Amino acid sequence: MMNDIAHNLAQVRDKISAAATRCGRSPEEITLVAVSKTKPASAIAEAIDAGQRQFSEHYVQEGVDKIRHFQELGVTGLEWNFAGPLQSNKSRLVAEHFDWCITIDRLRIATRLNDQRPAELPPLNVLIQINISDENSKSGIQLAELDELAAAVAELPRLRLRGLSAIPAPESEYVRQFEVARQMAVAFAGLKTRYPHIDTLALGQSDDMEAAIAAGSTMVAIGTAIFGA
């Protein structure tokens, strides 16, 4: 027998592996992040018992409480991503506790995170979020704004610019999912030619995973398919 979370993780990892191989990539090129927002520490603990080490949280206090909880238990090897929209007033908590911030879309927030990172911690890994296809969102920048933001973020020494992220508008057609993901892959490839250690393209959830992986995503973030509704 397996518990549901372990079963689900095995299923998702296998789908990712098959997609990678199918498009000529090594499965190791794709990092699975478990989206644990709204799920209790006990659920994360089951995921950890099933080998999962990287988790994404959307709400600052919830995430910090979980991070502290596992620190207190002495659980090692975890990586925590903050992937919610970040309000200025909560930036210090993120800077003090997270390993990655996925949603950088303004210089002011990057600068605060940089300035609030404790001296004893590694630099905070960051991705610049692109609004690639969502006319109904104000989160993420337009691609035309990327050069300006990336140059500024790259000069913040307590951050490490690692690449790009995006959450496309939901799309029913595979061909459109792929076209949008391809646009992100092109932007990502270009960024690599201009900055060091650009190695992360955070793109794709369950319904658009196949398109994202085929296009070049390196980091997929899955919630419901791991933890249930």
Side-chain angles (χ1 to χ4, degrees), residues 134-152:
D134 199 342
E135 303 282 48
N136 299 119
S137 180
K138 259 60 177 308
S139 295
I141 59 166
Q142 298 301 308
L143 273 180
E145 306 176 282
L146 179 54
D147 275 19
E148 174 172 355
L149 184 57

PDB file of all heavy atoms in Angstrom, residues 134-152:
ATOM      1  N   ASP A 134      -1.941  36.831 -20.008  1.00  0.00           N
ATOM      2  CA  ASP A 134      -3.147  37.063 -19.215  1.00  0.00           C
ATOM      3  C   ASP A 134      -3.588  38.529 -19.167  1.00  0.00           C
ATOM      4  O   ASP A 134      -3.101  39.324 -18.360  1.00  0.00           O
ATOM      5  CB  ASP A 134      -2.978  36.494 -17.803  1.00  0.00           C
ATOM      6  CG  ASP A 134      -4.303  36.291 -17.097  1.00  0.00           C
ATOM      7  OD1 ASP A 134      -5.316  36.884 -17.536  1.00  0.00           O
ATOM      8  OD2 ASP A 134      -4.324  35.550 -16.092  1.00  0.00           O
ATOM      9  N   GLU A 135      -4.527  38.878 -20.036  1.00  0.00           N
ATOM     10  CA  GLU A 135      -5.031  40.244 -20.085  1.00  0.00           C
ATOM     11  C   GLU A 135      -5.832  40.608 -18.839  1.00  0.00           C
ATOM     12  O   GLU A 135      -6.135  41.778 -18.614  1.00  0.00           O
ATOM     13  CB  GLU A 135      -5.905  40.439 -21.326  1.00  0.00           C
ATOM     14  CG  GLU A 135      -5.206  40.133 -22.642  1.00  0.00           C
ATOM     15  CD  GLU A 135      -4.274  41.244 -23.088  1.00  0.00           C
ATOM     16  OE1 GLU A 135      -3.468  41.722 -22.260  1.00  0.00           O
ATOM     17  OE2 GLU A 135      -4.356  41.650 -24.269  1.00  0.00           O
ATOM     18  N   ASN A 136      -6.179  39.610 -18.032  1.00  0.00           N
ATOM     19  CA  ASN A 136      -6.994  39.846 -16.846  1.00  0.00           C
ATOM     20  C   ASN A 136      -6.180  39.803 -15.558  1.00  0.00           C
ATOM     21  O   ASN A 136      -6.737  39.694 -14.469  1.00  0.00           O
ATOM     22  CB  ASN A 136      -8.133  38.829 -16.779  1.00  0.00           C
ATOM     23  CG  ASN A 136      -9.065  38.925 -17.973  1.00  0.00           C
ATOM     24  OD1 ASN A 136      -9.216  37.975 -18.748  1.00  0.00           O
ATOM     25  ND2 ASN A 136      -9.693  40.075 -18.128  1.00  0.00           N
ATOM     26  N   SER A 137      -4.861  39.882 -15.693  1.00  0.00           N
ATOM     27  CA  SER A 137      -3.979  39.929 -14.538  1.00  0.00           C
ATOM     28  C   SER A 137      -3.080  41.144 -14.596  1.00  0.00           C
ATOM     29  O   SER A 137      -2.709  41.599 -15.676  1.00  0.00           O
ATOM     30  CB  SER A 137      -3.117  38.676 -14.464  1.00  0.00           C
ATOM     31  OG  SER A 137      -2.271  38.741 -13.328  1.00  0.00           O
ATOM     32  N   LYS A 138      -2.732  41.659 -13.422  1.00  0.00           N
ATOM     33  CA  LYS A 138      -1.723  42.704 -13.316  1.00  0.00           C
ATOM     34  C   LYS A 138      -0.435  42.187 -12.678  1.00  0.00           C
ATOM     35  O   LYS A 138       0.468  42.968 -12.388  1.00  0.00           O
ATOM     36  CB  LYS A 138      -2.259  43.883 -12.507  1.00  0.00           C
ATOM     37  CG  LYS A 138      -2.725  45.059 -13.350  1.00  0.00           C
ATOM     38  CD  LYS A 138      -3.845  44.678 -14.287  1.00  0.00           C
ATOM     39  CE  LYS A 138      -4.331  45.896 -15.063  1.00  0.00           C
ATOM     40  NZ  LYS A 138      -4.650  47.021 -14.137  1.00  0.00           N
ATOM     41  N   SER A 139      -0.352  40.879 -12.453  1.00  0.00           N
ATOM     42  CA  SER A 139       0.871  40.272 -11.911  1.00  0.00           C
ATOM     43  C   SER A 139       1.809  39.825 -13.031  1.00  0.00           C
ATOM     44  O   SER A 139       1.371  39.240 -14.012  1.00  0.00           O
ATOM     45  CB  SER A 139       0.535  39.055 -11.041  1.00  0.00           C
ATOM     46  OG  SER A 139      -0.190  39.412  -9.873  1.00  0.00           O
ATOM     47  N   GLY A 140       3.106  40.060 -12.862  1.00  0.00           N
ATOM     48  CA  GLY A 140       4.066  39.767 -13.911  1.00  0.00           C
ATOM     49  C   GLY A 140       4.300  40.972 -14.807  1.00  0.00           C
ATOM     50  O   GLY A 140       3.422  41.820 -14.972  1.00  0.00           O
ATOM     51  N   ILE A 141       5.487  41.058 -15.393  1.00  0.00           N
ATOM     52  CA  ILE A 141       5.782  42.161 -16.299  1.00  0.00           C
ATOM     53  C   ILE A 141       5.573  41.753 -17.749  1.00  0.00           C
ATOM     54  O   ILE A 141       5.517  40.568 -18.073  1.00  0.00           O
ATOM     55  CB  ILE A 141       7.233  42.644 -16.156  1.00  0.00           C
ATOM     56  CG1 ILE A 141       8.220  41.508 -16.456  1.00  0.00           C
ATOM     57  CG2 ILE A 141       7.467  43.218 -14.756  1.00  0.00           C
ATOM     58  CD1 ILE A 141       9.657  42.002 -16.652  1.00  0.00           C
ATOM     59  N   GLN A 142       5.465  42.744 -18.623  1.00  0.00           N
ATOM     60  CA  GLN A 142       5.481  42.480 -20.052  1.00  0.00           C
ATOM     61  C   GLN A 142       6.904  42.147 -20.468  1.00  0.00           C
ATOM     62  O   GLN A 142       7.859  42.669 -19.883  1.00  0.00           O
ATOM     63  CB  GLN A 142       4.989  43.704 -20.827  1.00  0.00           C
ATOM     64  CG  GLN A 142       3.554  44.077 -20.511  1.00  0.00           C
ATOM     65  CD  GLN A 142       2.590  42.947 -20.821  1.00  0.00           C
ATOM     66  OE1 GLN A 142       2.587  42.406 -21.927  1.00  0.00           O
ATOM     67  NE2 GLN A 142       1.779  42.572 -19.839  1.00  0.00           N
ATOM     68  N   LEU A 143       7.059  41.296 -21.478  1.00  0.00           N
ATOM     69  CA  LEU A 143       8.393  40.932 -21.943  1.00  0.00           C
ATOM     70  C   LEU A 143       9.222  42.155 -22.296  1.00  0.00           C
ATOM     71  O   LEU A 143      10.433  42.163 -22.091  1.00  0.00           O
ATOM     72  CB  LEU A 143       8.334  39.994 -23.150  1.00  0.00           C
ATOM     73  CG  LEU A 143       8.239  38.508 -22.823  1.00  0.00           C
ATOM     74  CD1 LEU A 143       8.200  37.705 -24.104  1.00  0.00           C
ATOM     75  CD2 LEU A 143       9.406  38.075 -21.932  1.00  0.00           C
ATOM     76  N   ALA A 144       8.578  43.182 -22.843  1.00  0.00           N
ATOM     77  CA  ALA A 144       9.294  44.400 -23.215  1.00  0.00           C
ATOM     78  C   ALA A 144       9.992  45.070 -22.031  1.00  0.00           C
ATOM     79  O   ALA A 144      10.903  45.866 -22.231  1.00  0.00           O
ATOM     80  CB  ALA A 144       8.369  45.388 -23.899  1.00  0.00           C
ATOM     81  N   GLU A 145       9.563  44.756 -20.810  1.00  0.00           N
ATOM     82  CA  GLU A 145      10.121  45.367 -19.601  1.00  0.00           C
ATOM     83  C   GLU A 145      11.228  44.512 -18.980  1.00  0.00           C
ATOM     84  O   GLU A 145      11.837  44.901 -17.974  1.00  0.00           O
ATOM     85  CB  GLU A 145       9.015  45.578 -18.559  1.00  0.00           C
ATOM     86  CG  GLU A 145       7.803  46.374 -19.048  1.00  0.00           C
ATOM     87  CD  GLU A 145       6.689  46.462 -18.008  1.00  0.00           C
ATOM     88  OE1 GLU A 145       5.936  45.480 -17.828  1.00  0.00           O
ATOM     89  OE2 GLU A 145       6.559  47.526 -17.367  1.00  0.00           O
ATOM     90  N   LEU A 146      11.476  43.342 -19.557  1.00  0.00           N
ATOM     91  CA  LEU A 146      12.418  42.381 -18.967  1.00  0.00           C
ATOM     92  C   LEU A 146      13.863  42.881 -18.879  1.00  0.00           C
ATOM     93  O   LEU A 146      14.490  42.752 -17.836  1.00  0.00           O
ATOM     94  CB  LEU A 146      12.367  41.032 -19.694  1.00  0.00           C
ATOM     95  CG  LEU A 146      13.332  39.945 -19.196  1.00  0.00           C
ATOM     96  CD1 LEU A 146      13.210  39.680 -17.711  1.00  0.00           C
ATOM     97  CD2 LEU A 146      13.108  38.659 -19.971  1.00  0.00           C
ATOM     98  N   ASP A 147      14.397  43.434 -19.966  1.00  0.00           N
ATOM     99  CA  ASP A 147      15.789  43.882 -19.964  1.00  0.00           C
ATOM    100  C   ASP A 147      16.061  44.862 -18.817  1.00  0.00           C
ATOM    101  O   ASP A 147      17.089  44.776 -18.131  1.00  0.00           O
ATOM    102  CB  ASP A 147      16.158  44.547 -21.302  1.00  0.00           C
ATOM    103  CG  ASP A 147      16.590  43.552 -22.370  1.00  0.00           C
ATOM    104  OD1 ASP A 147      16.292  42.351 -22.237  1.00  0.00           O
ATOM    105  OD2 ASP A 147      17.231  43.981 -23.361  1.00  0.00           O
ATOM    106  N   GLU A 148      15.147  45.809 -18.627  1.00  0.00           N
ATOM    107  CA  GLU A 148      15.291  46.829 -17.597  1.00  0.00           C
ATOM    108  C   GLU A 148      15.240  46.222 -16.197  1.00  0.00           C
ATOM    109  O   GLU A 148      16.097  46.506 -15.359  1.00  0.00           O
ATOM    110  CB  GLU A 148      14.213  47.904 -17.767  1.00  0.00           C
ATOM    111  CG  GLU A 148      14.177  48.941 -16.658  1.00  0.00           C
ATOM    112  CD  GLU A 148      13.226  50.089 -16.946  1.00  0.00           C
ATOM    113  OE1 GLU A 148      12.657  50.143 -18.060  1.00  0.00           O
ATOM    114  OE2 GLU A 148      13.044  50.941 -16.048  1.00  0.00           O
ATOM    115  N   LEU A 149      14.247  45.375 -15.937  1.00  0.00           N
ATOM    116  CA  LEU A 149      14.122  44.786 -14.612  1.00  0.00           C
ATOM    117  C   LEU A 149      15.266  43.818 -14.310  1.00  0.00           C
ATOM    118  O   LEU A 149      15.830  43.838 -13.216  1.00  0.00           O
ATOM    119  CB  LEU A 149      12.761  44.095 -14.435  1.00  0.00           C
ATOM    120  CG  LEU A 149      12.481  43.523 -13.041  1.00  0.00           C
ATOM    121  CD1 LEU A 149      12.603  44.610 -11.985  1.00  0.00           C
ATOM    122  CD2 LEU A 149      11.117  42.852 -12.969  1.00  0.00           C
ATOM    123  N   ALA A 150      15.617  42.979 -15.276  1.00  0.00           N
ATOM    124  CA  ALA A 150      16.686  42.005 -15.064  1.00  0.00           C
ATOM    125  C   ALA A 150      18.015  42.680 -14.740  1.00  0.00           C
ATOM    126  O   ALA A 150      18.749  42.224 -13.864  1.00  0.00           O
ATOM    127  CB  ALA A 150      16.834  41.097 -16.275  1.00  0.00           C
ATOM    128  N   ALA A 151      18.336  43.756 -15.452  1.00  0.00           N
ATOM    129  CA  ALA A 151      19.608  44.432 -15.202  1.00  0.00           C
ATOM    130  C   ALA A 151      19.659  44.970 -13.772  1.00  0.00           C
ATOM    131  O   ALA A 151      20.685  44.875 -13.098  1.00  0.00           O
ATOM    132  CB  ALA A 151      19.850  45.540 -16.216  1.00  0.00           C
ATOM    133  N   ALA A 152      18.543  45.517 -13.300  1.00  0.00           N
ATOM    134  CA  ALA A 152      18.488  46.065 -11.954  1.00  0.00           C
ATOM    135  C   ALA A 152      18.524  44.969 -10.888  1.00  0.00           C
ATOM    136  O   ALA A 152      19.217  45.098  -9.882  1.00  0.00           O
ATOM    137  CB  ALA A 152      17.260  46.950 -11.796  1.00  0.00           C
TER     138      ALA A 152
END
